[PDB]
Amino acid sequence: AEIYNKDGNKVDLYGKAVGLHYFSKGGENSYGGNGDMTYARLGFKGETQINSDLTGYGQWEYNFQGNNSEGADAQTGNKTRLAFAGLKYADVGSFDYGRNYGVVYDALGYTDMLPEFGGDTAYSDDFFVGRVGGVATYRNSNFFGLVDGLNFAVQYLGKNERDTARRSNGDGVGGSISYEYEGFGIVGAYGAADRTNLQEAQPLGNGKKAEQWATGLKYDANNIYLAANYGETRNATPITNKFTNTSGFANKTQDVLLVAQYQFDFGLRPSIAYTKSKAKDVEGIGDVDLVNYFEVGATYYFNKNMSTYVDYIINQIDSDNKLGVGSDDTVAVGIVYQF
Amino acid sequence: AEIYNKDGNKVDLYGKAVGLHYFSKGGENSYGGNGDMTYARLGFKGETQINSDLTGYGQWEYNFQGNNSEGADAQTGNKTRLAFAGLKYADVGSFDYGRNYGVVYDALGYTDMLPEFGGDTAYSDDFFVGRVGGVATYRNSNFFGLVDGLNFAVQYLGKNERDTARRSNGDGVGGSISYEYEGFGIVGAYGAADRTNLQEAQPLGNGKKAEQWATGLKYDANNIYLAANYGETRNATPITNKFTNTSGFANKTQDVLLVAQYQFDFGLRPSIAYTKSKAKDVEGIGDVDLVNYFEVGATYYFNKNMSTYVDYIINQIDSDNKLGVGSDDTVAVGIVYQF
Amino acid sequence: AEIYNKDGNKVDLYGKAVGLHYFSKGGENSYGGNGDMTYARLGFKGETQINSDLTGYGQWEYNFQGNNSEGADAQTGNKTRLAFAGLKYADVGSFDYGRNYGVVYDALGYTDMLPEFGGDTAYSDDFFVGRVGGVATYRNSNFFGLVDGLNFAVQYLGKNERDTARRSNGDGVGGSISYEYEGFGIVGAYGAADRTNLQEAQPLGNGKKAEQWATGLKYDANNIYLAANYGETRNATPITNKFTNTSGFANKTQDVLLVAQYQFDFGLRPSIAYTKSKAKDVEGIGDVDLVNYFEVGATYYFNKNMSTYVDYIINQIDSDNKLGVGSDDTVAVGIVYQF
Ligand SMILES: [Cl-]
Ligand SMILES: [Cl-]
Ligand SMILES: [Cl-]
Ligand SMILES: [K+]
Ligand SMILES: [K+]
Ligand SMILES: [K+]
């Protein structure tokens, strides 16, 4: 909500409280888990006019987990989601630096619209597919204000040598090109980065370069949302063999995302989706499905602040998965207040 | 403070800064401890009108400890207190889910009014007596809008298998019935829940069911506050034998709470209280007093935002306590700003 | 930004998003490090009028690090900076308690004005030089409203026995006297405190008393800022021998701070500084320079909300430093949004 708006500077303090619970078998062997998954969000989105052409901004976002105790495990899953500050200059472009979404997410944000789950390939702290720290993102709107709908972006991923190879990355350059014409929209994104010494030492994944590319096709008009995403990654997708306890990456992945959603005028929004992600050239196995399911769910909007949703996952992953990926179904029930 | 109120949606961002210090002997052997106990609070309480009869809401609250260093122990005692979202519908009732107070606290909140201490039996993450995660609370006002003063509530505690048996719980159902007539108020609360496998493995506490019940009697009118609480728990109250280093629960407890407070028109609020909590059928000992003291303190209100208080505990616990519970007195001095 | 101002009570919720990156050789051997150093701030500064003469207040501040992953290292560098509540009474003085700046910082805040670095001697959780927990600070303005410019303060440091000797302190009393006359300003601060048993056990540092004193001279008028600080500490400055892996304190230090900054009317603010801190009577070595460099940088202000800065450190520390202190240069580039 906009709490301050004086002398060219506007401040929007936002947040949400989500009463969430998962229903599964037993739910260590399921898709999403079992039990309470209550969480809360908090952050600010500010914007200031320096002049008639130039505008400065800065956004922060935090995730608070409310499914923890007040004891020792009080900080489980508590982290900063977004943290960046930038400048946009008329019909030239916008530049920002800090913790922000990757350029491949510009294509993956097409199918990431499900009530609770979905967007399985949009991994956090994973080069260019999700939220990554130390990225210099340049974004352009309408090709310098000349060609309508034609947007392009470029990103510079800084070297992030961390404790775990799961969250580590080297120096990388990514980009995306998008065109939109009356409801329809097409995106073409690609990113390539170096792999750290800790990532190379892992028994899973082999290569000196990590590549990620994705294409998007959506129709967003007349209360209809039909979306499609196809992507492939090289030494980038984080994998874990549960039988041998081994961490690393998949050498080759092939991802298919399909989402169909409709918005009724009285508030209800049904959702039907399909997700398939197959890992290839995996050392020890070969070919294994990481993510495979059908999605059936609905989100009911009371207004702009209150919403309730159900999300059911028809998991197509079988219990004969060589990695040991969860096979059981997961049902999500959530109640949301947001400001 | 109410920072946003437009189009049926009101947002109240609140918080407090408390400059607190405890005075004790040595204070590992005392009731509350010794040294700096500065803390800060932050959170939001929002509410939105969907229609003339229906209202949606969501509340979040966090505790920040300011008695820590900026080094390694920077996150000691930092956690989320409340995190839930719910809907209230005219004269039908209110339903909410997430992290919220238990139904037994509806009776225990009667004597939990002391300047600093008190409410010893209101343990956090303990089935139904305090703040617990994964609770579906249904609350009714004035019996569907028919009988004045007569309120009743029902709660559904979800299974919370955690790292420690101290913070763990199974599936449980609780309830409370309250009647208020001109100053006077009487509450009757009860809750029963399953005990997890980790709780059963502990050398202290034996049973497959955890039960908690409490009754309340208060007079809150004409600047007078006289309150009384009596309760008993089965395999629920968290205990720790300091001689043998053993964790678990007490098989049977008997709790007595008595509070007498007066509010003067110039700001000062004196407080006199008595608390006794005896644990019975304790394996190895038998009968031991967990909490036993007299309370003498006062809170001075400057206005609605600023307040200072002193809280002195006349600890009646002797140094011959077989569990090894603190015997020394504890003096609290605090300065509070709140918005 | 002031978000609430009704009935004598004003609430200022503030924060900043800083997109920061350090440039260094390799940067474990440098002055400031290498890589992403994005961080975010959040907190409130409230003030309420009780009457025409008396005013109550309370301030809180938190640091969020945005250079971390969403995994295990998500809470690295996240802590509370300020947490206190106090009362100011007309021309008598202001008293506050909690986590607050030390009295020696009143002199050290003179040269702590650099774009990114500087203020090396202002160590956090270090008796009186920086931010410390459990301090009762009394501050006086204009000598009870009689002598203009003449301010004096007194502090009472509470005993803070913590996990590490680095962050530990005993009981202490500090004070500061400041006089300002038309641009010019002179400060004289001193503080003395007890050393805990854990601090005494450390192989570095010897003594039962920790002393800190500093003098300040600045000229702050006509867009000119020329500042100077000279100080000496006894068994107070935290040191670490990187060759032997030893923690403790320096027996004697001598600190010299010099800062020269100018403010241009179009927004740009150049900065030239010099810092020297020499540790004496160090057990095993004798005399070693902790901090020694020249500073060249500039901060450009777009308005009151947006700012960009560059900070270059010409490190004069040689690689023959017997403690093993970083010798390489460090370049800082930052983009800031604040509200
Ligand atoms: Cl997310
Ligand atoms: Cl509490
Ligand atoms: Cl700082
Ligand atoms: K998920
Ligand atoms: K307590
Ligand atoms: K620094």
PDB file of N, CA, C and O in Angstrom, chain C residues 43-73:
ATOM      1  N   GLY C  43      13.748   0.250   9.816  1.00  0.00           N
ATOM      2  CA  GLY C  43      13.518   0.623  11.209  1.00  0.00           C
ATOM      3  C   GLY C  43      12.611   1.825  11.388  1.00  0.00           C
ATOM      4  O   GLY C  43      12.237   2.484  10.414  1.00  0.00           O
ATOM      5  N   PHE C  44      12.259   2.107  12.641  1.00  0.00           N
ATOM      6  CA  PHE C  44      11.391   3.237  12.969  1.00  0.00           C
ATOM      7  C   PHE C  44      12.021   4.204  13.970  1.00  0.00           C
ATOM      8  O   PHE C  44      12.819   3.804  14.819  1.00  0.00           O
ATOM      9  N   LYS C  45      11.652   5.477  13.850  1.00  0.00           N
ATOM     10  CA  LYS C  45      12.084   6.518  14.777  1.00  0.00           C
ATOM     11  C   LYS C  45      10.870   7.341  15.204  1.00  0.00           C
ATOM     12  O   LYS C  45      10.456   8.269  14.504  1.00  0.00           O
ATOM     13  N   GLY C  46      10.302   6.986  16.353  1.00  0.00           N
ATOM     14  CA  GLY C  46       9.093   7.636  16.853  1.00  0.00           C
ATOM     15  C   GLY C  46       9.344   8.626  17.974  1.00  0.00           C
ATOM     16  O   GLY C  46      10.337   8.522  18.697  1.00  0.00           O
ATOM     17  N   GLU C  47       8.431   9.586  18.113  1.00  0.00           N
ATOM     18  CA  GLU C  47       8.536  10.629  19.132  1.00  0.00           C
ATOM     19  C   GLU C  47       7.146  11.135  19.522  1.00  0.00           C
ATOM     20  O   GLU C  47       6.332  11.465  18.655  1.00  0.00           O
ATOM     21  N   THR C  48       6.884  11.189  20.827  1.00  0.00           N
ATOM     22  CA  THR C  48       5.576  11.601  21.343  1.00  0.00           C
ATOM     23  C   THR C  48       5.672  12.699  22.406  1.00  0.00           C
ATOM     24  O   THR C  48       6.485  12.615  23.329  1.00  0.00           O
ATOM     25  N   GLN C  49       4.837  13.726  22.260  1.00  0.00           N
ATOM     26  CA  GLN C  49       4.756  14.803  23.244  1.00  0.00           C
ATOM     27  C   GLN C  49       3.801  14.440  24.378  1.00  0.00           C
ATOM     28  O   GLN C  49       2.589  14.322  24.173  1.00  0.00           O
ATOM     29  N   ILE C  50       4.362  14.256  25.570  1.00  0.00           N
ATOM     30  CA  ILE C  50       3.572  13.988  26.771  1.00  0.00           C
ATOM     31  C   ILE C  50       2.984  15.304  27.287  1.00  0.00           C
ATOM     32  O   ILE C  50       1.799  15.375  27.622  1.00  0.00           O
ATOM     33  N   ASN C  51       3.823  16.337  27.338  1.00  0.00           N
ATOM     34  CA  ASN C  51       3.380  17.705  27.618  1.00  0.00           C
ATOM     35  C   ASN C  51       4.214  18.740  26.853  1.00  0.00           C
ATOM     36  O   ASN C  51       4.904  18.397  25.888  1.00  0.00           O
ATOM     37  N   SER C  52       4.144  19.999  27.283  1.00  0.00           N
ATOM     38  CA  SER C  52       4.857  21.097  26.626  1.00  0.00           C
ATOM     39  C   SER C  52       6.367  21.062  26.871  1.00  0.00           C
ATOM     40  O   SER C  52       7.140  21.640  26.103  1.00  0.00           O
ATOM     41  N   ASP C  53       6.777  20.379  27.938  1.00  0.00           N
ATOM     42  CA  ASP C  53       8.183  20.317  28.338  1.00  0.00           C
ATOM     43  C   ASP C  53       8.782  18.921  28.160  1.00  0.00           C
ATOM     44  O   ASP C  53       9.976  18.784  27.889  1.00  0.00           O
ATOM     45  N   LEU C  54       7.948  17.894  28.309  1.00  0.00           N
ATOM     46  CA  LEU C  54       8.401  16.501  28.285  1.00  0.00           C
ATOM     47  C   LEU C  54       8.077  15.803  26.963  1.00  0.00           C
ATOM     48  O   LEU C  54       6.995  15.987  26.400  1.00  0.00           O
ATOM     49  N   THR C  55       9.027  15.002  26.484  1.00  0.00           N
ATOM     50  CA  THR C  55       8.887  14.272  25.224  1.00  0.00           C
ATOM     51  C   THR C  55       9.484  12.867  25.347  1.00  0.00           C
ATOM     52  O   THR C  55      10.617  12.701  25.805  1.00  0.00           O
ATOM     53  N   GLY C  56       8.709  11.864  24.938  1.00  0.00           N
ATOM     54  CA  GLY C  56       9.162  10.473  24.935  1.00  0.00           C
ATOM     55  C   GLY C  56       9.469   9.980  23.534  1.00  0.00           C
ATOM     56  O   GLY C  56       8.821  10.392  22.570  1.00  0.00           O
ATOM     57  N   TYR C  57      10.459   9.096  23.419  1.00  0.00           N
ATOM     58  CA  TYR C  57      10.884   8.577  22.117  1.00  0.00           C
ATOM     59  C   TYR C  57      11.370   7.124  22.166  1.00  0.00           C
ATOM     60  O   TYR C  57      11.611   6.575  23.243  1.00  0.00           O
ATOM     61  N   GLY C  58      11.503   6.519  20.988  1.00  0.00           N
ATOM     62  CA  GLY C  58      11.990   5.149  20.848  1.00  0.00           C
ATOM     63  C   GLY C  58      12.422   4.860  19.422  1.00  0.00           C
ATOM     64  O   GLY C  58      11.660   5.090  18.480  1.00  0.00           O
ATOM     65  N   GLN C  59      13.643   4.352  19.266  1.00  0.00           N
ATOM     66  CA  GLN C  59      14.212   4.101  17.941  1.00  0.00           C
ATOM     67  C   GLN C  59      14.700   2.663  17.773  1.00  0.00           C
ATOM     68  O   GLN C  59      15.312   2.091  18.679  1.00  0.00           O
ATOM     69  N   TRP C  60      14.421   2.094  16.602  1.00  0.00           N
ATOM     70  CA  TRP C  60      14.887   0.758  16.235  1.00  0.00           C
ATOM     71  C   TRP C  60      15.454   0.766  14.815  1.00  0.00           C
ATOM     72  O   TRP C  60      14.958   1.487  13.948  1.00  0.00           O
ATOM     73  N   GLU C  61      16.498  -0.029  14.593  1.00  0.00           N
ATOM     74  CA  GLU C  61      17.147  -0.126  13.285  1.00  0.00           C
ATOM     75  C   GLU C  61      17.711  -1.529  13.057  1.00  0.00           C
ATOM     76  O   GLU C  61      18.316  -2.116  13.956  1.00  0.00           O
ATOM     77  N   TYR C  62      17.506  -2.054  11.850  1.00  0.00           N
ATOM     78  CA  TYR C  62      17.959  -3.399  11.498  1.00  0.00           C
ATOM     79  C   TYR C  62      18.755  -3.406  10.196  1.00  0.00           C
ATOM     80  O   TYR C  62      18.486  -2.620   9.285  1.00  0.00           O
ATOM     81  N   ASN C  63      19.735  -4.304  10.123  1.00  0.00           N
ATOM     82  CA  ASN C  63      20.538  -4.496   8.919  1.00  0.00           C
ATOM     83  C   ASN C  63      20.245  -5.840   8.251  1.00  0.00           C
ATOM     84  O   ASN C  63      20.410  -6.896   8.864  1.00  0.00           O
ATOM     85  N   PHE C  64      19.798  -5.782   7.000  1.00  0.00           N
ATOM     86  CA  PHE C  64      19.555  -6.976   6.195  1.00  0.00           C
ATOM     87  C   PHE C  64      20.625  -7.083   5.115  1.00  0.00           C
ATOM     88  O   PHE C  64      20.830  -6.144   4.346  1.00  0.00           O
ATOM     89  N   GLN C  65      21.310  -8.223   5.062  1.00  0.00           N
ATOM     90  CA  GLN C  65      22.333  -8.455   4.043  1.00  0.00           C
ATOM     91  C   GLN C  65      21.738  -9.130   2.811  1.00  0.00           C
ATOM     92  O   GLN C  65      21.131 -10.200   2.908  1.00  0.00           O
ATOM     93  N   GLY C  66      21.911  -8.490   1.657  1.00  0.00           N
ATOM     94  CA  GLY C  66      21.379  -8.997   0.392  1.00  0.00           C
ATOM     95  C   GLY C  66      22.417  -9.666  -0.491  1.00  0.00           C
ATOM     96  O   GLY C  66      22.154  -9.935  -1.666  1.00  0.00           O
ATOM     97  N   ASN C  67      23.594  -9.929   0.071  1.00  0.00           N
ATOM     98  CA  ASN C  67      24.661 -10.633  -0.643  1.00  0.00           C
ATOM     99  C   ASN C  67      24.748 -12.112  -0.252  1.00  0.00           C
ATOM    100  O   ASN C  67      25.737 -12.790  -0.544  1.00  0.00           O
ATOM    101  N   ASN C  68      23.695 -12.597   0.405  1.00  0.00           N
ATOM    102  CA  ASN C  68      23.591 -13.991   0.821  1.00  0.00           C
ATOM    103  C   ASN C  68      22.653 -14.787  -0.085  1.00  0.00           C
ATOM    104  O   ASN C  68      21.858 -14.208  -0.831  1.00  0.00           O
ATOM    105  N   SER C  69      22.748 -16.112  -0.012  1.00  0.00           N
ATOM    106  CA  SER C  69      21.836 -16.995  -0.732  1.00  0.00           C
ATOM    107  C   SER C  69      20.557 -17.224   0.074  1.00  0.00           C
ATOM    108  O   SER C  69      20.445 -16.775   1.217  1.00  0.00           O
ATOM    109  N   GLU C  70      19.597 -17.922  -0.529  1.00  0.00           N
ATOM    110  CA  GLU C  70      18.349 -18.279   0.148  1.00  0.00           C
ATOM    111  C   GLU C  70      18.456 -19.629   0.866  1.00  0.00           C
ATOM    112  O   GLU C  70      17.466 -20.138   1.399  1.00  0.00           O
ATOM    113  N   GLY C  71      19.662 -20.194   0.883  1.00  0.00           N
ATOM    114  CA  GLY C  71      19.909 -21.500   1.489  1.00  0.00           C
ATOM    115  C   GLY C  71      20.298 -21.438   2.954  1.00  0.00           C
ATOM    116  O   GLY C  71      19.581 -20.857   3.772  1.00  0.00           O
ATOM    117  N   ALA C  72      21.440 -22.040   3.277  1.00  0.00           N
ATOM    118  CA  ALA C  72      21.908 -22.162   4.659  1.00  0.00           C
ATOM    119  C   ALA C  72      22.522 -20.875   5.213  1.00  0.00           C
ATOM    120  O   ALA C  72      22.347 -20.559   6.391  1.00  0.00           O
ATOM    121  N   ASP C  73      23.239 -20.142   4.362  1.00  0.00           N
ATOM    122  CA  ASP C  73      23.913 -18.906   4.770  1.00  0.00           C
ATOM    123  C   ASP C  73      23.029 -17.665   4.591  1.00  0.00           C
ATOM    124  O   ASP C  73      23.522 -16.578   4.279  1.00  0.00           O
TER     125      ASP C  73
END
